[PDB]
Design a binder for this molecule. Structure first.
Ligand code: 017
Lengths: 99, 99
Protein backbone atom coordinates (compact mmCIF):
# COMPACT_ATOMS: atom_id res chain seq x y z
CA UNK A 1 0.00 0.00 0.00
CA UNK A 2 0.89 3.68 -0.36
CA UNK A 3 0.49 5.63 2.88
CA UNK A 4 0.15 9.39 3.16
CA UNK A 5 1.28 11.22 6.29
CA UNK A 6 -1.67 13.45 7.23
CA UNK A 7 -2.12 11.08 10.20
CA UNK A 8 0.39 8.99 12.14
CA UNK A 9 1.24 5.99 9.90
CA UNK A 10 0.02 3.21 12.17
CA UNK A 11 -0.21 -0.40 11.02
CA UNK A 12 -1.56 -3.61 12.58
CA UNK A 13 1.08 -6.18 13.44
CA UNK A 14 1.20 -9.70 14.89
CA UNK A 15 4.12 -10.53 17.19
CA UNK A 16 4.47 -13.30 19.75
CA UNK A 17 0.86 -14.31 19.15
CA UNK A 18 -0.29 -10.83 20.21
CA UNK A 19 -2.01 -8.18 18.11
CA UNK A 20 -0.57 -4.67 18.25
CA UNK A 21 -0.44 -1.40 16.34
CA UNK A 22 2.96 0.10 15.51
CA UNK A 23 4.19 3.31 13.93
CA UNK A 24 6.03 3.11 10.61
CA UNK A 25 9.05 5.14 11.71
CA UNK A 26 11.70 5.98 9.12
CA UNK A 27 13.49 7.90 11.87
CA UNK A 28 13.92 4.74 13.96
CA UNK A 29 17.00 2.63 13.27
CA UNK A 30 15.55 -0.28 15.26
CA UNK A 31 12.13 -1.65 16.15
CA UNK A 32 10.94 -1.13 19.73
CA UNK A 33 7.73 -2.14 21.47
CA UNK A 34 6.17 -1.22 24.78
CA UNK A 35 6.44 -3.82 27.54
CA UNK A 36 5.08 -7.14 26.31
CA UNK A 37 5.26 -10.91 26.83
CA UNK A 38 7.94 -12.35 24.55
CA UNK A 39 9.61 -15.76 24.98
CA UNK A 40 13.28 -16.60 25.26
CA UNK A 41 16.50 -15.03 26.46
CA UNK A 42 17.32 -11.35 26.00
CA UNK A 43 20.22 -8.92 26.35
CA UNK A 44 20.02 -5.58 28.18
CA UNK A 45 20.82 -2.54 26.05
CA UNK A 46 20.08 1.19 26.07
CA UNK A 47 18.89 3.29 23.15
CA UNK A 48 18.88 7.05 22.76
CA UNK A 49 16.30 9.51 21.53
CA UNK A 50 15.05 13.08 21.71
CA UNK A 51 14.37 12.96 25.45
CA UNK A 52 17.42 10.93 26.45
CA UNK A 53 17.95 7.19 26.87
CA UNK A 54 15.91 4.18 27.96
CA UNK A 55 16.95 0.67 28.97
CA UNK A 56 15.37 -2.03 26.81
CA UNK A 57 15.54 -5.79 26.33
CA UNK A 58 16.95 -6.89 22.98
CA UNK A 59 15.48 -9.96 21.27
CA UNK A 60 16.99 -11.31 18.05
CA UNK A 61 15.31 -13.34 15.30
CA UNK A 62 11.79 -12.28 16.25
CA UNK A 63 8.97 -12.96 13.79
CA UNK A 64 6.61 -10.08 12.99
CA UNK A 65 3.70 -10.02 10.54
CA UNK A 66 3.51 -6.38 9.43
CA UNK A 67 0.21 -5.68 7.65
CA UNK A 68 0.24 -9.22 6.31
CA UNK A 69 3.99 -9.18 5.60
CA UNK A 70 6.20 -11.62 7.51
CA UNK A 71 9.63 -10.43 8.67
CA UNK A 72 12.29 -11.63 11.13
CA UNK A 73 14.62 -9.24 12.90
CA UNK A 74 15.71 -7.63 16.13
CA UNK A 75 12.91 -6.35 18.36
CA UNK A 76 13.49 -4.21 21.45
CA UNK A 77 11.03 -4.17 24.35
CA UNK A 78 11.06 -1.24 26.76
CA UNK A 79 9.49 1.99 28.02
CA UNK A 80 8.77 3.61 24.69
CA UNK A 81 5.62 5.77 24.75
CA UNK A 82 4.71 4.22 21.38
CA UNK A 83 5.43 1.03 19.45
CA UNK A 84 7.76 1.83 16.54
CA UNK A 85 8.77 -0.22 13.51
CA UNK A 86 12.37 0.73 12.74
CA UNK A 87 14.38 0.62 9.55
CA UNK A 88 15.82 -2.77 10.53
CA UNK A 89 12.43 -4.24 9.56
CA UNK A 90 11.07 -1.64 7.12
CA UNK A 91 13.73 -2.68 4.59
CA UNK A 92 12.51 -6.28 4.73
CA UNK A 93 9.04 -5.37 3.44
CA UNK A 94 10.60 -3.16 0.78
CA UNK A 95 9.30 0.08 2.28
CA UNK A 96 10.29 3.33 0.58
CA UNK A 97 9.68 7.05 0.92
CA UNK A 98 8.32 8.79 -2.17
CA UNK A 99 7.82 12.43 -3.13
CA UNK B 1 12.44 10.70 -5.66
CA UNK B 2 12.05 7.23 -4.16
CA UNK B 3 14.13 6.61 -1.03
CA UNK B 4 14.93 3.18 0.37
CA UNK B 5 15.67 2.72 4.07
CA UNK B 6 18.92 0.74 4.14
CA UNK B 7 20.53 4.02 5.29
CA UNK B 8 19.15 6.84 7.43
CA UNK B 9 16.95 8.87 5.03
CA UNK B 10 18.85 12.15 5.30
CA UNK B 11 18.11 15.01 2.90
CA UNK B 12 19.72 18.40 2.38
CA UNK B 13 17.58 21.41 3.28
CA UNK B 14 17.97 25.18 3.30
CA UNK B 15 16.43 27.08 6.22
CA UNK B 16 17.11 30.62 7.41
CA UNK B 17 19.81 30.97 4.78
CA UNK B 18 21.67 28.03 6.34
CA UNK B 19 22.41 24.62 4.83
CA UNK B 20 21.56 21.56 6.91
CA UNK B 21 20.83 17.85 6.62
CA UNK B 22 17.63 16.50 8.16
CA UNK B 23 16.10 13.07 8.68
CA UNK B 24 12.84 12.23 6.91
CA UNK B 25 11.03 11.05 10.04
CA UNK B 26 7.54 9.62 9.57
CA UNK B 27 7.51 8.99 13.31
CA UNK B 28 7.87 12.72 14.00
CA UNK B 29 4.63 14.69 14.12
CA UNK B 30 6.48 18.01 13.89
CA UNK B 31 9.81 19.26 12.57
CA UNK B 32 12.60 20.06 15.03
CA UNK B 33 16.16 21.25 14.46
CA UNK B 34 19.27 21.42 16.60
CA UNK B 35 20.20 24.81 18.02
CA UNK B 36 20.42 27.36 15.22
CA UNK B 37 20.05 31.04 14.36
CA UNK B 38 16.43 31.62 13.35
CA UNK B 39 14.76 35.05 13.11
CA UNK B 40 11.62 36.30 14.76
CA UNK B 41 9.42 35.63 17.76
CA UNK B 42 9.08 32.23 19.41
CA UNK B 43 6.98 30.43 22.02
CA UNK B 44 8.51 28.10 24.65
CA UNK B 45 7.09 24.58 24.61
CA UNK B 46 8.07 21.01 25.47
CA UNK B 47 7.89 17.96 23.21
CA UNK B 48 8.18 14.32 24.19
CA UNK B 49 9.96 11.32 22.75
CA UNK B 50 11.91 8.19 23.67
CA UNK B 51 13.61 8.79 26.99
CA UNK B 52 11.46 11.82 27.77
CA UNK B 53 10.93 15.46 26.83
CA UNK B 54 12.95 18.49 25.77
CA UNK B 55 12.22 22.21 25.93
CA UNK B 56 12.25 23.79 22.47
CA UNK B 57 11.62 27.13 20.79
CA UNK B 58 8.58 27.04 18.50
CA UNK B 59 8.67 29.14 15.32
CA UNK B 60 5.63 29.34 13.02
CA UNK B 61 5.45 29.90 9.26
CA UNK B 62 9.13 29.15 8.65
CA UNK B 63 10.31 28.59 5.08
CA UNK B 64 12.22 25.39 4.32
CA UNK B 65 13.49 24.16 0.94
CA UNK B 66 13.50 20.36 1.29
CA UNK B 67 15.58 18.75 -1.48
CA UNK B 68 14.51 21.51 -3.84
CA UNK B 69 10.92 21.61 -2.53
CA UNK B 70 9.79 24.80 -0.79
CA UNK B 71 7.50 24.47 2.24
CA UNK B 72 6.26 26.76 5.03
CA UNK B 73 5.36 25.42 8.44
CA UNK B 74 6.14 25.21 12.12
CA UNK B 75 9.77 24.50 13.00
CA UNK B 76 10.97 23.68 16.51
CA UNK B 77 14.52 24.45 17.64
CA UNK B 78 15.99 22.59 20.59
CA UNK B 79 18.28 19.88 21.98
CA UNK B 80 17.40 17.12 19.56
CA UNK B 81 20.22 14.63 18.89
CA UNK B 82 19.29 14.88 15.20
CA UNK B 83 17.45 17.20 12.84
CA UNK B 84 14.15 15.57 11.82
CA UNK B 85 11.59 16.57 9.20
CA UNK B 86 8.22 15.83 10.77
CA UNK B 87 4.87 15.00 9.23
CA UNK B 88 3.79 18.65 9.49
CA UNK B 89 6.11 19.32 6.53
CA UNK B 90 6.33 15.88 4.89
CA UNK B 91 2.66 16.15 3.92
CA UNK B 92 3.29 19.37 1.98
CA UNK B 93 5.91 17.80 -0.31
CA UNK B 94 3.48 14.96 -0.92
CA UNK B 95 5.65 12.36 0.80
CA UNK B 96 4.29 8.83 1.09
CA UNK B 97 5.37 5.44 2.41
CA UNK B 98 5.17 2.57 -0.07
CA UNK B 99 5.44 -1.20 0.26
C1 017 C 1 15.62 10.77 18.15
C2 017 C 1 15.11 10.61 16.68
C3 017 C 1 16.12 9.83 15.77
C4 017 C 1 13.68 10.04 16.66
N1 017 C 1 13.46 8.57 16.71
C5 017 C 1 12.24 8.08 15.89
C6 017 C 1 11.11 9.17 15.83
O1 017 C 1 10.15 8.78 14.91
C7 017 C 1 10.47 9.36 17.22
C8 017 C 1 9.47 8.25 17.50
C9 017 C 1 8.59 8.56 18.71
C10 017 C 1 7.21 8.82 18.53
C11 017 C 1 6.40 9.10 19.63
C12 017 C 1 6.95 9.12 20.89
C13 017 C 1 8.32 8.85 21.08
C14 017 C 1 9.13 8.58 19.97
N2 017 C 1 9.76 10.62 17.24
C15 017 C 1 10.22 11.81 17.99
O2 017 C 1 10.92 11.74 18.95
O3 017 C 1 9.73 13.02 17.49
C16 017 C 1 9.18 13.99 18.36
C17 017 C 1 9.02 15.33 17.34
O4 017 C 1 7.81 15.17 16.77
C18 017 C 1 6.94 14.59 17.96
O5 017 C 1 6.13 13.73 17.55
C19 017 C 1 6.18 12.53 18.64
C20 017 C 1 7.46 12.42 18.94
C21 017 C 1 7.98 13.82 18.89
S1 017 C 1 13.68 7.71 18.21
O6 017 C 1 12.37 7.50 18.89
O7 017 C 1 14.37 8.50 19.21
C22 017 C 1 14.50 6.07 17.99
C23 017 C 1 15.86 5.96 18.10
C24 017 C 1 16.48 4.72 17.94
C25 017 C 1 15.72 3.60 17.66
N3 017 C 1 16.39 2.27 17.49
C26 017 C 1 14.35 3.70 17.55
C27 017 C 1 13.74 4.93 17.71
Amino acid sequence: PQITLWKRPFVTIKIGGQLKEALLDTGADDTIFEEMNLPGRWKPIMIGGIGGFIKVRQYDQILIEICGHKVIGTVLVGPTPINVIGRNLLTQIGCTLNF
